[PDB]
Write a protein that binds this DNA or RNA. Structure first.
Length: 170
DNA sequence: TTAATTAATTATAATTAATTATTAATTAATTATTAATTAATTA
């Protein structure tokens, strides 16, 4: 009746490209999945929607993309995932890199440089250091890299069971 | 459906400007005295 898996991704990039199939494939294993498309903006952080499901989730599974560092709504939300995780280690994180190196995520260089080249003219000089401290630790856990040739279909089946193995056996 | 105003939101790109680099290549000049046999002479 509650949520056992909570996703997070980019807007226009992978909302129909691949994450959509995983939502439809996952529902075939009899588990309730949460994905959201509402652009929020109704304020700066909504409570009864995101904040509710965050504490209700069980396996936070982000999906870092190529342009995941531009939306001013994703990063600060990810800062709430990995922060809540460090307080109670009962839950886990299974990131999935996508079309990007597992090196442009630990130092925000490469395809993120100019993203933080303009993000530094608006916000505080400490809030940005809060993101780069949280975004870094995500790029150290285990994760299926998806190269240019790997099957966008076989990976889904392999990763889904790893989410279903931690539920049946508990 | 249009025109018009207000309110926000999202973009990368181009140019100018500066610092930062031992390497590429030839020229030129100096420096390296044996290798080697031949010729001549001597023990």
């Amino acid at each position: 009746v509650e949520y056992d898996v909570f996703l997070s991704f980019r807007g226009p990039d992978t909302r129909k490209q691949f994450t959509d199939f995983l939502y439809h494939f996952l529902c075939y294993y009899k588990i309730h999945t949460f994905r959201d498309d509402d652009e929020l903006r109704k304020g700066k952080e909504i409570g009864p929607n995101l904040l509710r499901a965050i504490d209700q989730s069980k396996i936070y599974v982000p999906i870092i993309s190529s342009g995941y560092a531009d939306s001013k709504w994703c990063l600060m939300e990810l800062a709430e995932i990995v922060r809540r995780q460090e307080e109670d280690p009962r839950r886990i994180i299974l990131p999935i890199f996508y079309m990007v190196d597992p090196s442009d995520v630990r130092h925000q260089t490469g395809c993120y440089k100019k993203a933080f080249r303009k993000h530094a003219n608006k916000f505080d000089g400490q809030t940005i250091q809060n993101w780069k401290d949280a975004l870094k630790k995500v790029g150290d856990l285990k994760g299926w890299h998806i190269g240019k040739d790997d099957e966008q279909g076989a990976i889904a089946d392999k990763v889904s069971a790893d989410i279903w193995s931690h539920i049946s056996k508990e």
